[PDB]
Amino acid sequence: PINVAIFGSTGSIGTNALNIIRECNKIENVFNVKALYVNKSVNELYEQAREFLPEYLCIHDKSVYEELKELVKNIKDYKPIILCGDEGMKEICSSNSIDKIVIGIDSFQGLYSTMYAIMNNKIVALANKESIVSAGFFLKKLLNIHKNAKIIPVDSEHSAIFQCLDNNKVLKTKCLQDNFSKINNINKIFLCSSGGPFQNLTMDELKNVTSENALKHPKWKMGKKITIDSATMMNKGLEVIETHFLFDVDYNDIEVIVHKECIIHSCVEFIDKSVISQMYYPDMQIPILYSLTWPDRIKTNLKPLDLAQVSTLTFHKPSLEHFPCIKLAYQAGIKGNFYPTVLNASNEIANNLFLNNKIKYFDISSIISQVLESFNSQKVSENSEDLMKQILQIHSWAKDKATDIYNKHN
Amino acid sequence: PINVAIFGSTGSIGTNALNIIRECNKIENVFNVKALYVNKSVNELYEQAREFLPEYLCIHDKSVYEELKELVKNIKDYKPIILCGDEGMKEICSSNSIDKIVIGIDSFQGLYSTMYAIMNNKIVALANKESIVSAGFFLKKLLNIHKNAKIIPVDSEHSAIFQCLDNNKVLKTKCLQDNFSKINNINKIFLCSSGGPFQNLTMDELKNVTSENALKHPKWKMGKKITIDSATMMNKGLEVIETHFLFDVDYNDIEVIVHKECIIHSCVEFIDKSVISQMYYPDMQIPILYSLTWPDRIKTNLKPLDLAQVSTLTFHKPSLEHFPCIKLAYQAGIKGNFYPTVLNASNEIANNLFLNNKIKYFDISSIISQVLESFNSQKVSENSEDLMKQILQIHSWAKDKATDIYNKHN
Ligand SMILES: Cc1cccc(CCC[C@H](CC(=O)N(C)O)CP(=O)(O)O)c1
Ligand SMILES: Cc1cccc(CCC[C@H](CC(=O)N(C)O)CP(=O)(O)O)c1
Ligand SMILES: [Mn+2]
Ligand SMILES: [Mn+2]
């Protein structure tokens, strides 16, 4: 029986996690959902609690804590531990009845809960790429201290890469460990991208695109921030850095490829030049499920891939002139130090300004570029707590720098 | 160092094996070629012996044994154990200084050497698909007895499938064993086919295709028999049965799919519905190398797959009306017993009659069908020696039956 906690159970990752857990448990009783954690969606948490009956419930927003305790009295034969805030999150992480933790929270509570999961030697199914990009060094350090903790990637491309690896080798190392690529015989990574909604626009059309155009008739259901990142290809830029940290693959050995059908999720070239790829319909249930079952697989009732119906798969190189965010991401990664923290932070501001119609498409990369040019590399702290504080300082600095640049050329 | 014997070292598989061994050894000394075995190409064997300096040389033709003695005196600092015939093959198989044997021989002699390799608990890199189709029961029995012996597939599609599997699972079992698919969480196999030269042809056009049309195929270096089998899709038919035996996958769970670009070499759908595929340019060196390095991979200097240049991959269902050999292969496989032996034997005759312009395209399938219809299921011998004789008897009967059908019609 696999004992799981879901952090951010009402968000996109959380609800997909619970859906695939539900459907797999109908086939064979594999998962016990031991804990659910949400920010403030007390009614939805209640509905999930009624179905999954977790031992722990945690709500971040203290103002709905009493409402949750009263709602839960409706449920028959059920006495959960009901917790609140950061403190409740920490208690869940330290429970011996939880093996695996799904992190479905964005950058703030996300890195925070990831750190506590690692400190408690849990298996951590991590969807939050911003955390790896911004705090990669710190996560590596922490995993070197907490030797039984493991990060398993949930991001579709990174799960794909992970699924292409031989577990006989993966089991002798772990993600974010030095020499991971050597041990797994990895030579090169093809990181597949949908290309986003602006992939076929001319330069002249790109100058005038708005966030409405990016968010209009979205071929897949996702949040506004990641949709904007897909539009600029900064999503794939962040994913390049994520790939480098997760798998210890050199930046010269990570190739972004536009694959508009979104069937091949990424490919790995091994040192013999054989390439292995993972394929499925665009559906987050597979990456989530694999993070929870690894190194095994279990039966699902998901629709089988019909390759003849799919019929055609295409691949092309993205234009760095049309998508300068990719270039900026490689440059920041290659420069190393805290440049990735700065890249992620300045993008967070630039993304939000474009979303809210304050700046144009090419202003996004301009702002990020200027913040990166502005940054001065710092001595990397040896102490893990000092390092965390350093990352937080740089993140805050970079957000304020981007905002100041916006306010200058207002 | 990996100690490898090459059986049939001057044939296509054998020379490709020595090429990749040569190239990999320039990067790092990984392989010691300990034995070479050929039928009668004593000059080519001398040239290979001059480069690889194997401890054993063997020549099946007793007559040219004396000519090999005198040629090998020309090589300096080199006193090899020169053996001959089946007695020499067996002494090579019984050597404790040989780990792996590449079997690139066709017909009975390929099966006979395989048997002796298995009897000495060797790793057998097996390229002869006809031997698995015809003698699968016999090989399975032999592998159950000889617990440390293993067959590792060299056929490109079967190597691809094998490469897609998790070696943490593969190492708990081995090919041609009951429950292999269960242990490896395999749900379904996509068996990729080039489709051969006739995919767009109408039924009326297929009626009059000749072997010259099948063999006017300046694309990949392969022999006449397999080129004819590619044209009829009986090659894929035989590979379906091979798949069933190697990996214990049900016939209803093997799908032939036409992939004309020959980049994806086959795909495995696991029980979660995630699909893993292996990809490379059409090149037999990767499948051969993997059979010799499994469960590890080593560095090569092969050209890296350029996916953006490839650009497009296509897939479609083959038409069973146009390629009835595929339907017959499934039918023979599903019926079980010695029907695959009969299928293989009758195809051997029909293929050769078409190759020599004695029959037409649809006569191939017609002849095979009638032989299959004439065959009465036989009780499968429990004794290992009776079973080998049973297989040989049925093989012979089926070839005669096919020939008699041709002679009545002619
Ligand atoms: C839900 C789903 C699952 C697999 C693939 C897709 C297509 C969108 C892929 C990207 C979103 C993402 O980063 N995922 C899903 O990890 C969009 P992008 O490739 O950056 O244009 C969507
Ligand atoms: C040399 C090479 C290597 C990989 C793929 C190919 C394309 C021909 C594939 C088939 C030949 C074969 O059975 N192999 C190679 O195992 C021809 P087919 O798919 O039956 O039409 C050729
Ligand atoms: Mn992604
Ligand atoms: Mn083949």
Nearest neighbour of B279 by CB, restricted to A277, A305, A317: A277
From chain A, the residues in CB contact with B275 under 8 A are 278-280, 305
Q: How far apart are CA A310 and CA A89, in angstroms?
A: 43
Burial environment of residue B303 by CB neighbours within 10 A (0 to 12, 13 to 18, 19 or more):
exposed
Burial environment of residue A408 by CB neighbours within 10 A (0 to 12, 13 to 18, 19 or more):
exposed
**What are the angstrom distances between the C-alpha of A53 and each of A32, A50, B372?**
9, 6, 59
Using the mean position of ligand 1's atoms as its centre, give its distance from the Cα of residue A220 in Å.
8
- Our mutation pick for probing the ligand 2 site, out of B217, B235, B281, counting the most ligand atoms within 8 A of Cβ, is B235
DSSP-derived letter for residue A382 is: S
Given an 8 Å threshold on Cβ–Cβ distance, is A305 in contact with B269?
yes
Q: How many CB atoms lie within 10 A of CB B327?
A: 16
Given an 8 Å threshold on Cβ–Cβ distance, is A163 in contact with B274?
yes
Nearest neighbour of A315 by CB, restricted to B269, B274, B308: B308
Query: A374-388 as b/e, with b when 16 or more CB fall inside 10 Å?
Result: ebeeeeebeebeebb
Given an 8 Å threshold on Cβ–Cβ distance, is B297 in contact with A271?
yes
Given an 8 Å threshold on Cβ–Cβ distance, is B168 in contact with A163?
no
- Is A217 annotated in a binding site? The answer is yes
Ligand 1 contact, A284 CB (< 6 A): yes
**Min distance B162 CA to chain A CA atoms (Å):** 11
Using the mean position of ligand 4's atoms as its centre, give its distance from the Cα of residue B399 in Å.
23
Q: How far apart are CA A362 and CA A103, in angstroms?
A: 32
**Min distance B144 CA to chain A CA atoms (Å):** 24
The dotted CATH code for A320-410 is: 1.10.1740.10
Nearest neighbour of B307 by CB, restricted to A171, A190, A286: A190
The CATH architecture to which A1-155 belongs is: 3-Layer(aba) Sandwich (3.40)
Given an 8 Å threshold on Cβ–Cβ distance, is A302 in contact with B277?
no
**Min distance B254 CA to chain A CA atoms (Å):** 13
Q: Are the C-beta atoms of A36 and A48 separated by less than 8 Å?
A: yes
Q: How far apart are CA A247 and CA A234, in angstroms?
A: 20
Nearest ligand to the C-alpha atom of residue A226 = 1
Given an 8 Å threshold on Cβ–Cβ distance, is B273 in contact with A286?
yes
Closest protein CA for atom 4 of ligand 1: A282
Query: A122-160 as b/e, with b when 16 or more CB fall inside 10 Å?
Result: bbbbbbbbbbbbbbbbbbbbbbeebeebbbbbbbbbbbb
- Our mutation pick for probing the ligand 2 site, out of B163, B222, B302, counting the most ligand atoms within 8 A of Cβ, is B222
**What are the angstrom distances between the C-alpha of B108 and each of B105, B119, B132, B135, B196?**
9, 16, 11, 10, 27
SS3 at position A81:
strand
Query: Read out DSSP for A178-216?
Result: TTHHHHTTEEEEEEEE---TTTT--HHHHHH--HHHHHS
The residue extents of the domains of chain A are 1-155, 156-319, 320-410
Locate the chain B residue with the closest alpha carbon to A257. B308
For testing contact with chain B, the best of A313, A317, A319, A320 (most B CBs within 10 A): A313
From chain B, the residues in CB contact with A303 under 8 A are 273
For residue A55, the Cα-to-chain-centroid distance in whole angstroms is 26
List, in sequence order, every residue forming a beta bridge with A153; answer none if it has no partner: A126
B144, B147, B152, B157 alpha-carbon torsion, rounded to 10°: 30
Burial environment of residue B270 by CB neighbours within 10 A (0 to 12, 13 to 18, 19 or more):
buried
DSSP H or E run through A131: helix A129-145
Q: First-to-last CA distance in chain B?
A: 57
For the record, the structure tokens of A49 come out as 């609690």
Nearest neighbour of B315 by CB, restricted to A295, A310, A317: A310
Closest protein CA for atom 14 of ligand 1: A156
Using the mean position of ligand 1's atoms as its centre, give its distance from the Cα of residue A266 in Å.
11
Helices (H), A146-299: 156-163, 167-170, 180-183, 203-208, 211-215, 224-232, 234-247, 285-293
For the record, the structure tokens of A311 come out as 């019929």
Check residue A273 and give left, alpha or beta (phi > 0: left; psi -120 to 50: alpha): left
DSSP-derived letter for residue A358 is: S
For the record, the structure tokens of B45 come out as 């064997």
**Resolution expressed in Å:** 1.8
List, in sequence order, every residue forming a beta bridge with B186; answer none if it has no partner: B270
Q: How far apart are CA A99 and CA B82, in angstroms?
A: 61
Burial environment of residue A15 by CB neighbours within 10 A (0 to 12, 13 to 18, 19 or more):
middle
The 3-class SS string of chain B reads: CEEEEEECCCCHHHHHHHHHHHHHHHHCCCEEEEEEEECCCHHHHHHHHHHHCCCEEEECCHHHHHHHHHHHCCCCCCCCEEEEHHHHHHHHHHCCCCCEEEECCCHHHHHHHHHHHHHCCCEEEECCHHHHHHHHHHHHHHHHHCCCCEEEECCHHHHHHHHCCCHHHHCCCCCCCCCHHHHCCEEEEEEEECCCCCCCCCHHHHHCCCHHHHHCCCCCCCCHHHHHHHHHCHHHHHHHHHHHHHHCCCHHHEEEEECCCCCEEEEEEECCCCEEEEECCCCCHHHHHHHHHCCCCCCCCCCCCCHHHHCEEECECCCCCCCHHHHHHHHHHHHCCCHHHHHHHHHHHHHHHHHCCCCCHHHHHHHHHHHHHHCCCCCCCCCHHHHHHHHHHHHHHHHHHHHHHHHHHC
- Is A85 annotated in a binding site? The answer is no
List, in sequence order, every residue forming a beta bridge with B256; answer none if it has no partner: B191
Using CB distances shorter than 6 Å, the residues near ligand 2 are: B 155-157, 193-196, 220, 230, 235-236, 262, 282-284
From chain A, the residues in CB contact with B269 under 8 A are 304-305
What contacts B319, CB < 8 A, 6 or more positions away?
none
Query: A309-326 as b/e, with b when 16 or more CB fall inside 10 Å?
Result: eeeebbbbebeeebbbbb
- Is A8 annotated in a binding site? The answer is no
